[PDB]
Amino acid sequence: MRPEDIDAGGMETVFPWRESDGDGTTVESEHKLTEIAMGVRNPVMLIRIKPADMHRVIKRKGQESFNFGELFAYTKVCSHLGCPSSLYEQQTYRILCPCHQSQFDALEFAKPIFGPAARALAQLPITIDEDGYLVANGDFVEPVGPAFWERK
Amino acid sequence: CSAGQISQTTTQEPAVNGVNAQAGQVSLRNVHLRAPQQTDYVEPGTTVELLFVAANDSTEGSNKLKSITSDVGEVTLTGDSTVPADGVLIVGEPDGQIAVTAEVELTKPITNGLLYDFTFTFEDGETTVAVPISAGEQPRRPVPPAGPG
Amino acid sequence: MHIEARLFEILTAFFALAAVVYAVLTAMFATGGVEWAGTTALVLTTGLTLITGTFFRFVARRLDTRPEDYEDAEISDGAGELGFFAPHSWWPILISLSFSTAAVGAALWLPWLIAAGVAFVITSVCGLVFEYYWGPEKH
Amino acid sequence: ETGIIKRLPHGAYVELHQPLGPVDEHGHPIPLEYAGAPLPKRMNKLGSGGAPGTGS
Amino acid sequence: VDVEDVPSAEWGWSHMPIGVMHIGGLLSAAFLLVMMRGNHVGHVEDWFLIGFAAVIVALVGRNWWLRRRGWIR
Amino acid sequence: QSALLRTGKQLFETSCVSCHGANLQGVPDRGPSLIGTGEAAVYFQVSTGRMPAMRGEAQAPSKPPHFDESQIDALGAYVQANGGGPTVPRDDHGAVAQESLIGGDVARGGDLFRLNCASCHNFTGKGGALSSGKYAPDLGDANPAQIYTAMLTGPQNMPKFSDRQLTPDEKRDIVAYVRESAETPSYGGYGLGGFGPAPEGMAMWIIGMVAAIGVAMWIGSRA
Amino acid sequence: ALFMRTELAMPGLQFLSNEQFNQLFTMHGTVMLLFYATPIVFGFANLVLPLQIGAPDVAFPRLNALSFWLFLFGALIAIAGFITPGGAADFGWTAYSPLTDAIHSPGAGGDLWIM
Amino acid sequence: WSDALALGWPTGITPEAKLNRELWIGSVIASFAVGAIVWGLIFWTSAFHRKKATDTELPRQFGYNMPLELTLTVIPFLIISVLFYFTVVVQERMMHKDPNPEVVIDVTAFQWNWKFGYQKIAFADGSFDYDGADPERKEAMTSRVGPIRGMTPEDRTYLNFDKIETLGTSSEIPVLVLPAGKRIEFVLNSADVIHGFWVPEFLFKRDVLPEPKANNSDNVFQVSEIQQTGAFVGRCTEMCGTFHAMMNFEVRVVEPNDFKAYIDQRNAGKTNAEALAAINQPPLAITTEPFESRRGELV
Numbered sequence A: 001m002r003p004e005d006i007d008a009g010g011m012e013t014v015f016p017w018r019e020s021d022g023d024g025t026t027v028e029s030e031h032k033l034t035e036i037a038m039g040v041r042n043p044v045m046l047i048r049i050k051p052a053d054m055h056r057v058i059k060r061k062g063q064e065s066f067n068f069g070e071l072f073a074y075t076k077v078c079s080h081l082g083c084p085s086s087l088y089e090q091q092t093y094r095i096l097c098p099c100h101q102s103q104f105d106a107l108e109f110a111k112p113i114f115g116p117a118a119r120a121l122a123q124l125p126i127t128i129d130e131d132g133y134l135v136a137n138g139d140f141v142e143p144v145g146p147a148f149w150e151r152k
Numbered sequence B: 001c002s003a004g005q006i007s008q009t010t011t012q013e014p015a016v017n018g019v020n021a022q023a024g025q026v027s028l029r030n031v032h033l034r035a036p037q038q039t040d041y042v043e044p045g046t047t048v049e050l051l052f053v054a055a056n057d058s059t060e061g062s063n064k065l066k067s068i069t070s071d072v073g074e075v076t077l078t079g080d081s082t083v084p085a086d087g088v089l090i091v092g093e094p095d096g097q098i099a100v101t102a103e104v105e106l107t108k109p110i111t112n113g114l115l116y117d118f119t120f121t122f123e124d125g126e127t128t129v130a131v132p133i134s135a136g137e138q139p140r141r142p143v144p145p146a147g148p149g
Numbered sequence C: 001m002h003i004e005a006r007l008f009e010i011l012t013a014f015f016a017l018a019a020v021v022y023a024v025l026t027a028m029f030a031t032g033g034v035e036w037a038g039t040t041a042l043v044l045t046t047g048l049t050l051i052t053g054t055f056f057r058f059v060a061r062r063l064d065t066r067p068e069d070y071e072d073a074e075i076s077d078g079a080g081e082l083g084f085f086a087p088h089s090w091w092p093i094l095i096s097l098s099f100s101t102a103a104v105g106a107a108l109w110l111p112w113l114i115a116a117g118v119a120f121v122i123t124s125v126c127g128l129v130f131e132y133y134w135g136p137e138k139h
Numbered sequence D: 001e002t003g004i005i006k007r008l009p010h011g012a013y014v015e016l017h018q019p020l021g022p023v024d025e026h027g028h029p030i031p032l033e034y035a036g037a038p039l040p041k042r043m044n045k046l047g048s049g050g051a052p053g054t055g056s
Numbered sequence E: 001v002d003v004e005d006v007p008s009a010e011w012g013w014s015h016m017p018i019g020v021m022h023i024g025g026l027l028s029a030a031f032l033l034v035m036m037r038g039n040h041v042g043h044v045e046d047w048f049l050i051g052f053a054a055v056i057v058a059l060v061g062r063n064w065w066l067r068r069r070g071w072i073r
Numbered sequence F: 001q002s003a004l005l006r007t008g009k010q011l012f013e014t015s016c017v018s019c020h021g022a023n024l025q026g027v028p029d030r031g032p033s034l035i036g037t038g039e040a041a042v043y044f045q046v047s048t049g050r051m052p053a054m055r056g057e058a059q060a061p062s063k064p065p066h067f068d069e070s071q072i073d074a075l076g077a078y079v080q081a082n083g084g085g086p087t088v089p090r091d092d093h094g095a096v097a098q099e100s101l102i103g104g105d106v107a108r109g110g111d112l113f114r115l116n117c118a119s120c121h122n123f124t125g126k127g128g129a130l131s132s133g134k135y136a137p138d139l140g141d142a143n144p145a146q147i148y149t150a151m152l153t154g155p156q157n158m159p160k161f162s163d164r165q166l167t168p169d170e171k172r173d174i175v176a177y178v179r180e181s182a183e184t185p186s187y188g189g190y191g192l193g194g195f196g197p198a199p200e201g202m203a204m205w206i207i208g209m210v211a212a213i214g215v216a217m218w219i220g221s222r223a
Numbered sequence G: 001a002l003f004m005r006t007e008l009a010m011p012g013l014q015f016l017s018n019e020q021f022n023q024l025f026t027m028h029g030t031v032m033l034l035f036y037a038t039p040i041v042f043g044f045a046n047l048v049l050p051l052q053i054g055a056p057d058v059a060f061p062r063l064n065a066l067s068f069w070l071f072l073f074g075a076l077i078a079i080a081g082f083i084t085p086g087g088a089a090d091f092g093w094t095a096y097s098p099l100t101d102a103i104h105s106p107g108a109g110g111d112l113w114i115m
Numbered sequence H: 001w002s003d004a005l006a007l008g009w010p011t012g013i014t015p016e017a018k019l020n021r022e023l024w025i026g027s028v029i030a031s032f033a034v035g036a037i038v039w040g041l042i043f044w045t046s047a048f049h050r051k052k053a054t055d056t057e058l059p060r061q062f063g064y065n066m067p068l069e070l071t072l073t074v075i076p077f078l079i080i081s082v083l084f085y086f087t088v089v090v091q092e093r094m095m096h097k098d099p100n101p102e103v104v105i106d107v108t109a110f111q112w113n114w115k116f117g118y119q120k121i122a123f124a125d126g127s128f129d130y131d132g133a134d135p136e137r138k139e140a141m142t143s144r145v146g147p148i149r150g151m152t153p154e155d156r157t158y159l160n161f162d163k164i165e166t167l168g169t170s171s172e173i174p175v176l177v178l179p180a181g182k183r184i185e186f187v188l189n190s191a192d193v194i195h196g197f198w199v200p201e202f203l204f205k206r207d208v209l210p211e212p213k214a215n216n217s218d219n220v221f222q223v224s225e226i227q228q229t230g231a232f233v234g235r236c237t238e239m240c241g242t243f244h245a246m247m248n249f250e251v252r253v254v255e256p257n258d259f260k261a262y263i264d265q266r267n268a269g270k271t272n273a274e275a276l277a278a279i280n281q282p283p284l285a286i287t288t289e290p291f292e293s294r295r296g297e298l299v
């Protein structure tokens, strides 16, 4: 995927893919891609903030450089119970979870603003390589998904 | 409750890649840069196009556009940059348009996804826009086919 | 009950006169010709008083003077059973709830809610009609 | 309460009641004691409506 | 309770202590007030919570005052 | 065509200046700029009847259109001439393409719809509620052109899927699934709205339990 | 009416929007004319009219009770437009056409007002 | 004083307004005279017929005065009959239309603003003739079987279009320029809903309807002349939606020579604001100003 493939106000689900994963033509390649698809913490939402709204973005400590300009990547797994929160409203910049109605402010580092969610969605650092393809700029700085007793 | 002074529909921005700007009395709409890309950067020396529409809020007098500057290169204005009394001034010819143009000679590399500051002066106000790069109706560039891994 | 229909015949004559006058006055020197909405309403407004008045005229000439139609009747003249009057019923509130359910379905255009409301109204109306006619359980 | 309203010669309006037990010499029924069982409230449920008639 | 208030007082459970309803109402209003603590950014809901809590507190206080003065039993 | 442009502006002046401005720059707190939205946005917003809007609320609802096909094209051309933008697909005769937009791979469209649309529009485009007064309307009434333009322009809260994020062939596959999932009859009886367990539980309580209790009354005795 | 009258005290919109004010006089008038004045006509009728004519009851006691509940639930349906996000009816109690058409009044508040 | 008895009625700038104002003052005087009599009778019996402390027997039980009753039904009939005659006289004068107006104005009302077009100008002295009819844009609206007499509800052919048109904006109040002392004809057509064409100084208004001919509405009214120059506000009176209170307009009255100069400027491609400045007039409306676009003070 490339940064110009997504317009302002658009959202797209992305998955962690490597060169060695292959195109799925080979039997071992299919199993590797199947594992990517069924990974419960794999899906990530890529949103492109409208440039006129970039002044309203509030950065989280330790995540000020996690965005490639106006492209932001947040985990698709809701922090409450693990449902995919993929109801992205482009104008209000709200991420709504269809399971228990949790709402996250995409401008304020996906901080929850409604529902039973109390923790913000993890942000994935992103960048581009020499060929211009969007790649991850590291790993999540916090665990992804529902919380547990041993978390943080 | 949702029909009060704070309304969700009324404050919505256009679903376009351009940027709105207020240059004192001139409304800058759909401000974006056209720059086809091949690699991670558009190298210096490449000529790109800056496209926008200037709207005259006032309806009594006229206005003229001068001195578009940016820290990405030099911007050249060709044509009659005067906006009429209550009309528009279309700078650039975007895709889907069946002649004022803004030609930018790059000094430092640019890439789609970031914001680059541009300065607009007409006669009564100088503002910064932070213009983005917008691919228009161009098709998705082909991706080389991955191997078996 | 000669006064009751005389009230309706008096209203009938005025409504008939107004309906005729309005139709003629709108046919001439009025843009668009006869104004149909008001003329139709006035003509059938006469019909409302005509049907009620005619029925009361037929009922009046059948039965003789009632105690409440007498100019010098005694209270003891009305002794006897008056008729059946329902002592209590919770069916009327169910009928309104049934009708309100259908109206809400029609307002939001939910055909399933409209169908439920119509079925509720029929069941609720059936209960009101059959309330004082159901026999004892048979076992 | 049978639902039938009767006008007395002096103008009183009274409703005919169906006693469920013994009555007084004046005609008013003797009050009965609650026994935890349902009590009839409609005359038609007590058989006052009769039967329409045997046949198809 | 007496049979004059509840006719079938001897046929089943017919009395609930007034202290249970009074304390429950006060805990009812307190739970509404603590729910303003949350992630919601609007305050329309907060005023609704305040109004309902105030109504519940007023009802509990009126009942307690009337029972204390002896106007109701 | 100069005839189409002046007709569109003439229609625009008495219907779209109060909220969008005379020069399409937008009226603050009343309406956004129409520069660069393109003919596709105008086609969707007018043919679906969403525009002209009547008031400010959580979400502008759909209603009967205020213009016919010829006036929609004129309005689209006028807005298109101001800023450019995406255009509605057209067939050989120049009319708005409807049948040619139906893709041939409905299985691919189903997976794409479930990845990209099901979240807001439900498993079978029945609609879904959004945050505060907003909602994803049922998709059973939109023609293929309207679905294509909605995916292109991203109206209100729907993401503006570009031709690079979703290729024309992918969009045609999605509208094929949208059009077929709405025209496919239910196989196990009445569909009950297709909303899942919620109508199913309501139907049980109001039909089966009512019948079961009603039958119990008939067999059983009172008191 | 207190909300409107407070808003009209000073020029400029202090706390109400145009839409909310439009909904206010529509519903204010609907409630006063159809939900207060018309029913209380029958309010005084059930109080004294059988007494005034020396009657023991109305002609149809169950139909009389049906009117009250039809009136209470019908009024609640129209008022229930205020809980919708769009709001209640805003075209005035006169409901002049074609302002009440689905093109110009697409909200569900107007439909609840009609039903 | 006539101003006190007018109860806020503007003086008027047209002879029809003057005649209407004269009828209003006389009717108010008649109404006040009747009200004073009835209020005095109510106050008289309330102050002098109260129960005293030295009365034991009930008052005289009279409840029928036939001669008084018959008299009290004729006097109100006479007053309304007199008022009806003057009412009929005034409305005939106000609704009278001359077959040869000097200025014809096309008034187009829409949600939520105004558009003013100059259909035809024909001065009675022959010093100015102009035909502003634009039939090549009226035939472009036709939409066509059709649900209504072969036409779809989007026909819009009932509207009128002109070469010189003043179009209203959200940040620019539309100003209509008219000559003083000339007969003006107003043709009212509404695009969408019903609006209201009210100039308070005209002391007259008429509703602006879509498809006025199909609704049997006479959408044309004339004023004999405007007796003074200046600027007068105009407001919408018919509930037309969200911005029913924010679509005011202004009527600017200038001298015949000034009006001719203004029309020439408009014919020369000048906008309404600069053409007004060309005749030494304020470019914007002075009686009213555009409303702030913000939905309120809390935004």
Ligand SMILES: CCCCCCCCCCC(=O)OC[C@H]1O[C@H](O[C@@H]2[C@H](O)[C@@H](O)[C@H](O)[C@@H](O[C@H]3O[C@H](CO[C@H]4O[C@H](CO[C@H]5O[C@H](CO)[C@@H](O)[C@H](O)[C@@H]5O[C@H]5O[C@H](CO)[C@@H](O)[C@H](O)[C@@H]5O)[C@@H](O)[C@H](O)[C@@H]4O)[C@@H](O)[C@H](O)[C@@H]3O)[C@@H]2OP(=O)(O)OC[C@@H](COC(=O)CCCCCCCC[C@H](C)CC)OC(=O)CCCCCCCCCC)[C@@H](O)[C@@H](O)[C@@H]1O
Binding pocket: A149, A150, A151, A152
């Ligand atoms: C009585 C109940 C009332 C409550 C009070 C009593 C309990 C309160 C007392 C304590 C207590 O709760 O104990 C019970 C629990 O015990 C065991 O939990 C302990 C501990 O608590 C957990 O927090 C901890 O997380 C567990 O380590 C796992 O993660 C470790 C890492 O994590 C740390 O980092 C996390 C996130 O960050 C990092 O994330 C990733 C980690 O790599 C990487 O991405 C990355 O490195 C990142 O780091 C960054 O850091 C910096 C950034 O700035 C920079 O450097 C870099 O940038 C870098 O990137 C945080 O989120 C975490 O919080 C944490 O800080 C790994 O290191 C480990 O390898 C492993 O994976 C750990 O487990 P351990 O060590 O394996 O075992 C020990 C032993 C438990 O000791 C006890 O005291 C037991 C007795 C007391 C409890 C009751 C039992 C006895 C009573 C009787 C039996 C009754 C009759 O085990 C056991 O016997 C457990 C047996 C089962 C229970 C039986 C109950 C009885 C059964 C019947 C009922 C687990 O079993 C839990 O399931 C269990 O609940």
Ligand SMILES: CCCCCCCCCCCCCCCC(=O)OC[C@H]1O[C@H](O[C@@H]2[C@H](O)[C@@H](O)[C@H](O)[C@@H](O[C@H]3O[C@H](CO)[C@@H](O)[C@H](O)[C@@H]3O)[C@@H]2OP(=O)(O)OC[C@@H](COC(=O)CCCCCCCC[C@H](C)CCCCCCCC)OC(=O)CCCCCCCCCCCCCCC)[C@@H](O)[C@@H](O)[C@@H]1O
Binding pocket: B001, B003, B004, B005, B006, B007, E041, E042, E043, E044, E047, E048, E050, E051, E052, E054, E055, E058, G015, G016, G017, H298, H299
């Ligand atoms: C006596 C009995 C009943 C009496 C009640 C009748 C009178 C009540 C009076 C209420 C006032 C009416 C005003 C209506 C108009 C209105 O509302 O327009 C105001 C604007 O406000 C919001 O903008 C705020 C700003 O203007 C913006 O500048 C700002 O930006 C924005 O900030 C948010 O938004 C930003 C985004 O921009 C974010 O950045 C930011 O972070 C934040 O989120 C602001 O928003 P926010 O704080 O949400 O405030 C919203 C409204 C809030 O509404 C409301 O009235 C809520 C309704 C409450 C009603 C109470 C319920 C009663 C229940 C029943 C009666 C119980 C049953 C009884 C039982 C039976 C009886 C047995 C005895 O505030 C107010 O009006 C003030 C509230 C004061 C009311 C006091 C009443 C309390 C109850 C007391 C009762 C005591 C009783 C005791 C008895 C003894 C937006 O909505 C705007 O569009 C809107 O335009």
Ligand SMILES: CCCCCCCCCCCCCCCC(=O)OC[C@H]1O[C@H](O[C@@H]2[C@H](O)[C@@H](O)[C@H](O)[C@@H](O[C@H]3O[C@H](CO)[C@@H](O)[C@H](O)[C@@H]3O)[C@@H]2OP(=O)(O)OC[C@@H](COC(=O)CCCCCCCC[C@H](C)CCCCCCCC)OC(=O)CCCCCCCCCCCCCCC)[C@@H](O)[C@@H](O)[C@@H]1O
Binding pocket: C111, C112, C113, C115, C116, F126, F138, F139, F140, F141, F181, F182, F183, F184, F185, F186, F189, F190, F191, F192, F193, F194, F202, F203, F206, F207, F211
């Ligand atoms: C003893 C007891 C035992 C008996 C129990 C059995 C009872 C069941 C009886 C019924 C069985 C019917 C079998 C046939 C099945 C069938 O062949 O099915 C046809 C098709 O039909 C629907 O297609 C519609 C169109 O044809 C499509 O063109 C259109 O596209 C589609 O639209 C959907 O799709 C669009 C995108 O495509 C979306 O845009 C859109 O929004 C929507 O989703 C449409 O569907 P829709 O609008 O759903 O309804 C339309 C319904 C209208 O509703 C209804 O049936 C409502 C009524 C039933 C529904 C269930 C009850 C609801 C209960 C609620 C709880 C009510 C709430 C109350 C609240 C109170 C409590 C709360 C606290 O019209 C009809 O069928 C008319 C038929 C009416 C027949 C009535 C039966 C008569 C019985 C008489 C018995 C006499 C016996 C006497 C003996 C003596 C869809 O289903 C299709 O899939 C389906 O294929």
Ligand code: HEC
Binding pocket: B009, B010, B012, B013, B014, B015, B016, F012, F015, F016, F018, F019, F020, F030, F031, F032, F033, F034, F037, F041, F042, F045, F046, F051, F052, F053, F054, F055, F056, F060, F075, F153, F155, F156, H111
């Ligand atoms: C005020 C009541 C409006 C009128 C009258 C018209 N429009 Fe509008 N429009 C309005 C708003 C508040 C919005 C934004 C939110 C929404 O409901 O979509 C819009 C949106 C549009 C768009 C979409 C813009 C985008 O970003 O792509 C278009 C193309 C549009 N409006 C066109 C349009 C036309 C042609 C109108 C005259 C028929 C018209 N609008 C009237 C507010 C209002």
Ligand code: HEC
Binding pocket: A087, A088, A089, A090, F048, F050, F060, F061, F062, F113, F116, F117, F118, F119, F120, F121, F135, F136, F137, F138, F139, F141, F142, F146, F147, F148, F150, F151, F155, F156, F157, F158, F159, F161, F174, F175, F178
């Ligand atoms: C939630 C964030 C959405 C996602 C993801 C998708 N859609 Fe959507 N859609 C959404 C809304 C809120 C609306 C209404 C907008 C309006 O301006 O009123 C829509 C609208 C449509 C429509 C138009 C439907 C009509 O009324 O007939 C269509 C055809 C549609 N949406 C289709 C669609 C598809 C195919 C999507 C996957 C790419 C999709 N939507 C995503 C909300 C959301």
Ligand SMILES: CCCCCCCCCCCCC
Binding pocket: H003, H004, H005
């Ligand atoms: C120049 C303005 C003078 C104010 C006139 C006020 C008239 C008051 C009339 C009161 C009538 C009450 C019935």
Ligand code: FES
Binding pocket: A078, A079, A080, A081, A082, A083, A085, A097, A098, A099, A100, A101, A102, A115, A116, A117
């Ligand atoms: S799963 Fe996202 S809200 Fe509970």
Ligand SMILES: [Ca+2]
Binding pocket: G006, G007, G008, G009, G010, G011, G012, G013, G014
């Ligand atoms: Ca104010």
Ligand SMILES: [Cu+2]
Binding pocket: H109, H110, H112, H194, H195, H196, H236, H238, H239, H240, H244, H247
């Ligand atoms: Cu208007």
Ligand SMILES: [Cu+2]
Binding pocket: H195, H196, H236, H237, H238, H239, H240, H241, H243, H244, H245
């Ligand atoms: Cu108006």
